[PDB]
Write an enzyme that holds these catalytic residues in place. Structure first.
Site, PDB file in Angstrom:
ATOM      1  N   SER A 157       2.991 -38.189 -10.954  1.00 45.90           N
ATOM      2  CA  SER A 157       4.229 -38.673 -10.179  1.00 45.90           C
ATOM      3  C   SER A 157       5.207 -38.657 -11.449  1.00 45.90           C
ATOM      4  CB  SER A 157       3.981 -39.835  -9.527  1.00 45.90           C
ATOM      5  OG  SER A 157       5.333 -40.218  -8.839  1.00 45.90           O
ATOM      6  N   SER A 158       6.538 -38.208 -11.187  1.00 45.62           N
ATOM      7  CA  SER A 158       7.366 -38.344 -12.232  1.00 45.62           C
ATOM      8  C   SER A 158       8.123 -39.833 -12.044  1.00 45.62           C
ATOM      9  CB  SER A 158       8.304 -37.296 -11.944  1.00 45.62           C
ATOM     10  OG  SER A 158       8.154 -36.053 -12.668  1.00 45.62           O
ATOM     11  N   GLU A 194       8.581 -44.867  -2.000  1.00 48.19           N
ATOM     12  CA  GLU A 194       7.155 -45.227  -2.209  1.00 48.19           C
ATOM     13  C   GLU A 194       6.644 -46.570  -1.523  1.00 48.19           C
ATOM     14  OE1 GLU A 194       6.466 -45.764  -6.250  1.00 48.19           O
ATOM     15  OE2 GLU A 194       6.037 -43.850  -6.431  1.00 48.19           O
ATOM     16  N   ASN A 219      -0.251 -40.471  -6.278  1.00 48.67           N
ATOM     17  CA  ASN A 219       0.042 -39.141  -6.952  1.00 48.67           C
ATOM     18  C   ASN A 219      -0.527 -39.360  -8.286  1.00 48.67           C
ATOM     19  OD1 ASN A 219       3.216 -39.979  -5.503  1.00 48.67           O
ATOM     20  ND2 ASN A 219       1.772 -38.276  -4.937  1.00 48.67           N
ATOM     21  N   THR A 241       9.639 -29.044  -7.659  1.00 51.74           N
ATOM     22  CA  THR A 241       9.515 -28.087  -9.104  1.00 51.74           C
ATOM     23  C   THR A 241       9.928 -26.608  -8.572  1.00 51.74           C
ATOM     24  OG1 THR A 241       8.377 -29.736 -10.332  1.00 51.74           O
ATOM     25  CG2 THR A 241       8.265 -27.526 -10.989  1.00 51.74           C
ATOM     26  N   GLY A 244      10.459 -39.801  -4.878  1.00 52.01           N
ATOM     27  CA  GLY A 244      10.299 -40.024  -3.466  1.00 52.01           C
ATOM     28  C   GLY A 244      10.299 -41.397  -3.146  1.00 52.01           C
ATOM     29  N   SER A 302       5.875 -36.374  -4.763  1.00 50.36           N
ATOM     30  CA  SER A 302       5.332 -35.394  -5.549  1.00 50.36           C
ATOM     31  C   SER A 302       4.713 -34.380  -4.789  1.00 50.36           C
ATOM     32  CB  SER A 302       4.933 -35.804  -6.633  1.00 50.36           C
ATOM     33  OG  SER A 302       5.741 -36.786  -7.246  1.00 50.36           O
ATOM     34  N   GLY A 303       4.554 -32.978  -5.491  1.00 46.83           N
ATOM     35  CA  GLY A 303       3.660 -32.142  -4.662  1.00 46.83           C
ATOM     36  C   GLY A 303       4.353 -31.331  -3.566  1.00 46.83           C
TER      37      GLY A 303
END
Lengths: 721, 145
Positions: free
Chosen positions: A159-160, A381, A156, A111, A379, A106-107
């Site tokens: 985080s999704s 982990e 995160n 997106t 992603g 994430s980041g």
């Protein structure tokens, strides 16, 4: 057409298949060398590597969206517009459906990548305004999906915890009709238990924070995270997160997406049931072989007042089980149901919300539709404490990569045959041994974890691990304290097992694998909830209809995913796939900082170096004989200016002129193959030094004509005899 | 022994003279490329700098007429085609149209080889018309002869 190449003014190396030597050193040092020149996009064949710049770069100009219009990859420098182009042309000309798979932490800009793919497509598909009637609803919907599907983990803060699919739908002419949003692989376990330092999903903390006391009194709530079990005391306020504000932003977004305030109010009632549904405790009935019983009925009473269900039927539900009769549940069996009702009420509502958005932009007309879609899965982990939750994320990344490494290998082998070129078996990493280690239905971890949850006997985590240790021992990709590596490393402690993924070894802790795998929604709960007075709650639980077949359920949690990851790989295969590997250069959201440490981890996670060995496949460069000549004919004095025609024999006599050994290349039926880049860089260097002789030729001749013309004119004006 | 002929030797002095202003009887170092080029010669400034370092160990820029002659005798055999100089342009063409972007001409003629100066490439341009330049029309121009 155009006669360009990405080798021209190449910073570093644009397509990492031209890397030599190929080690992780040279790889990190090339996405840093490029990065420092704002060249964040890099290729692995047809794949783009996107390192987040954390600023706006002037490469997203309208002149690019056209410069990269209808051009192959090598014809221009690497850019995400080359993937969006391939996609659109394949969509447009082949009537294919396009999935774009985005992977990373994430980041990393996943997106942002999806927004640049779809904002290219709108610019070139002709009907751009109608396309962007869809990209806006998908935007205004983001803060709701996040509140219900994102969460703060120990790495995160946003985080999704789900797989994200979105697409935009055209017909077979190119006229867009609508969009879709899909939700995948929700971490339902996070609702009921979370680790320390981590946090439950956003929407719980946004509600209690920024709901006016009036709104918290309609739902039997109170501003005190220390009063709720499904929430955490300490880990409930995040740096730079104003859940009060976000809640106003989620209350707005629903309004513009299309929620009647009854609909919305009835949504936040269900977040309120689930939050308060984890406050119910149970104690044994007069108890060595006895039953279970509630402790208090106050919070249950509130749930019934709120949900308009009948305490008697929930009281009976959490305790009995009518099947085949009405066996009574143990206390553990009763907590497992208070949870299973919680997570299978959150997930059913989140999936409900997603399909309430798609009603807006569902394609009305029932005509064939092509698809332009993006899949943003979550992603890899490697946490300090890895649990059941990460097992899925990493098993999902292993299914996707194996599906990809073999597809990529299949298509390269399918080309070396078109050009009558021999194959050389790539001693790569078959990813399937880890999948088999996990998802096998006989000796799998999932099957043997499920098999300890089907026992009526007494089963704890240490029995499941000492089950793994018995049968998973000899699997070279399984190592534990009693199983048995030959490497000098400190021994593993108890209550953990380590397995080797394609992204490296991950150490999983067993505490929770049995609880996080019990997702037992037996009918007495679906039935007690179908008897609700809530138009929403009764709509999430259709198996509670007595008419509907009483069959079974998804018996387990790991089972519920192995099937949910199956329907994904099965949908993604029916599509034309392209991939974007999104990378964070710094944890600190900093613009121009690149940490070789943090980026290398993601190079592992994304599995990038195997892509290079797989796509190299022996010969690293190939070019059709025609452009390969028009570009290098100027290097010998036998092809300059022409020819030799045709091109295969002109190139042949060109190489046998530069004295370059014959082992360094091969002749395909349309393309010339070069094994090592160190040759192609020798040709592209000679060209750089030959063109310095062509320039000098034009320069020397313009100087002569300018002076000879200046002289005869002058001495023609000598007529003054 | 040059090896050269008089009617040539006629052609060259005409040009030698008007660059020889002083009457001291020689053209300066910097006066040789402009008198070379003025009679059918297209020499690279490197070739010119070679010639200079050969004659002039006198610490000043001076060249006699016979050594001049023997500096012009070999260069006639130094043919330079037209389909070469035509391809040298086509290498620098985005398309195969024959129209070259006036900027990618200024870029080349000022970044590669014997760099041309800012005023050279501007007046080269104004002689080559009109945002673009028909380099195939520019080569006949410079090679009709």
């Amino acid at each position: 057409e155009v006669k360009s190449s990405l080798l021209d003014n190449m910073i570093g190396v644009g397509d990492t298949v031209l890397l030599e030597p190929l080690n992780e050193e040279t790889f990190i040092d090339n996405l840093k060398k490029r990065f420092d020149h704002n060249e964040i996009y890099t290729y692995i064949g047809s794949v783009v590597i996107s390192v987040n710049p954390y600023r706006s770069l002037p490469i997203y100009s309208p002149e690019k969206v056209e410069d990269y219009r209808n051009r192959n990859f090598y014809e221009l420098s690497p850019h995400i517009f080359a993937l969006s182009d391939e996609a659109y042309r394949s969509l447009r000309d082949q009537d294919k459906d396009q999935c774009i798979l985005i992977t990373g932490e994430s980041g990393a800009g996943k997106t942002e990548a999806s927004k640049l793919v779809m904002s290219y497509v709108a610019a070139v598909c002709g009907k751009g305004a109608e396309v962007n009637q869809v990209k806006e609803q998908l935007l205004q919907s983001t803060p709701v999906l996040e509140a219900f599907g994102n969460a703060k983990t120990v790495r995160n803060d946003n985080s999704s915890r789900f797989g994200k699919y979105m697409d935009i739908e055209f017909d077979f002419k190119g006229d867009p009709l609508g969009g879709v949003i899909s939700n995948y692989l929700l971490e339902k376990s996070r609702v009921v238990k979370q680790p320390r330092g981590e946090r439950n999903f956003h929407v719980f903390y946004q509600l209690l924070s920024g709901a006016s006391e009036e709104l918290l009194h309609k739902l039997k709530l109170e501003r005190d995270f220390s009063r709720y079990n499904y929430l955490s005391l300490d880990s409930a306020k995040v740096n730079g997160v104003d859940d009060a504000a976000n809640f106003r932003t989620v209350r707005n977004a629903m309004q513009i997406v299309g929620f009647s305030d009854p609909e919305a109010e009835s949504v936040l009632e269900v977040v309120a049931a689930v939050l308060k549904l984890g406050n119910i405790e149970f104690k044994p009935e007069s108890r060595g072989l006895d039953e279970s019983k509630i402790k208090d009925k106050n919070e249950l009473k509130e749930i019934c007042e709120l949900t308009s269900i009948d305490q008697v039927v929930l009281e009976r539900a959490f305790s009995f089980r009518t099947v085949e009769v009405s066996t009574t549940l143990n206390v553990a069996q009763a907590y497992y149901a208070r949870d299973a009702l919680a997570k299978n009420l959150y997930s059913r509502l989140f999936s409900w919300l997603v399909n309430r958005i798609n009603e807006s932009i569902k394609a009305q007309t029932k005509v064939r539709k092509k698809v332009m879609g993006v899949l943003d899965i979550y992603g890899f982990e490697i946490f300090e404490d890895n649990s059941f939750e990460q097992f899925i994320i990493n098993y999902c990344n292993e299914k996707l990569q194996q599906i990809f490494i073999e597809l990529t290998l299949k298509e390269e082998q399918e080309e070396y045959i078109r050009e009558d070129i021999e194959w050389t078996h790539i001693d790569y990493f078959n990813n399937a041994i880890i999948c088999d280690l996990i998802e096998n239905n006989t000796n799998g971890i999932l099957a043997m974890l499920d098999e300890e949850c089907l026992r009526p006997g007494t089963v704890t985590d240490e029995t499941f691990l000492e089950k793994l240790n018995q049968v998973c021992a000899t699997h070279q990709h399984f190592e534990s304290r009693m199983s048995k590596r030959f490497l000098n490393d400190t021994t593993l402690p108890h209550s953990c097992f380590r397995i080797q993924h394609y992204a490296g070894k991950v150490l999983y802790q067993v505490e929770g694998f049995v609880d996080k795998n019990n997702d037992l929604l037996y009918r007495d709960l679906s039935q007690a909830m179908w008897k609700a007075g809530h138009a929403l709650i009764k709509s999430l639980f259709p198996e509670g209809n007595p008419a509907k077949v009483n069959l079974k359920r998804p018996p387990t949690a790991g089972s519920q995913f192995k099937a949910s990851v199956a329907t994904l790989m099965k949908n993604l295969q029916t599509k034309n796939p392209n991939y974007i590997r999104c990378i964070k250069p710094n944890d600190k959201k900093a613009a121009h900082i690149f940490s070789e440490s943090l980026v290398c981890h993601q190079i592992r996670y994304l599995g990038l170096l195997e892509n290079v060995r797989v796509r190299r496949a022996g010969y690293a460069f190939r070019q059709a004989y025609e452009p390969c000549l028009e570009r290098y004919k100027m290097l010998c004095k036998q092809t300059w200016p022409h020819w030799k025609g045709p091109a295969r024999s002109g190139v042949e006599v060109l190489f046998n002129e530069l004295e370059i050994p014959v082992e360094e290349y091969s002749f395909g039926r349309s393309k010339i193959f070069i094994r090592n880049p160190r040759t192609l860089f020798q040709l592209e260097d000679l060209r750089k030094q030959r063109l310095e002789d062509l320039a000098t030729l034009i320069q020397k001749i313009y100087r002569g004509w300018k002076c000879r013309t200046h002289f005869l004119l002058m001495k023609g004006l000598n007529d003054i005899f | 022994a040059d090896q050269l002929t008089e009617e040539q030797i006629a052609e060259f002095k005409e040009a030698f003279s008007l660059f020889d202003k002083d009457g001291d009887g020689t053209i300066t170092t910097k006066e040789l490329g402009t008198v070379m080029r003025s009679l059918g010669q297209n020499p690279t400034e490197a070739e010119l700098q070679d010639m200079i370092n050969e004659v002039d160990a006198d610490g000043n820029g001076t060249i006699d007429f016979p050594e001049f002659l023997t500096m012009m005798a070999r260069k006639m055999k130094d043919t330079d085609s037209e389909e070469e100089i035509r391809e040298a342009f086509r290498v620098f063409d985005k398309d195969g149209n024959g129209y070259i972007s006036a900027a990618e001409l200024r870029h080349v003629m000022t970044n590669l080889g014997e760099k041309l100066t800012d005023e050279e490439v501007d007046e080269m341009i104004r002689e080559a018309d009109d945002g673009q330049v028909n380099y195939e029309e520019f080569v006949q121009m410079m090679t009709a002869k």
